[PDB]
Design a protein around this ligand. Structure first.
Ligand code: ZN
Ligand code: ZN
Length: 58
């Protein structure tokens, strides 16, 4: 569920959760770029901001 182009990922090749870099890159309502697998996995585990520690209302 990524609406951003791979261009963004290339420009920002670095994960905050799973670390490293890949391709898929989605943006959270808080202001963070997470991969499809990294995010999805996060949403399945917890719906909280890894950094902001704030719950996403969307
Ligand atoms: Zn990642
Ligand atoms: Zn955040």
């Amino acid at each position: 569920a990524v609406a951003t182009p791979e261009e963004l990922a290339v420009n920002n090749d670095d994960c905050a959760i799973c670390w490293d870099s890949m391709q898929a890159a989605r943006k959270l309502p808080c202001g963070h770029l997470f991969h499809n697998s990294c995010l999805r996995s996060w949403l399945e585990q917890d719906t909280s901001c890894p950094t902001c520690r704030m719950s996403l209302n969307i």
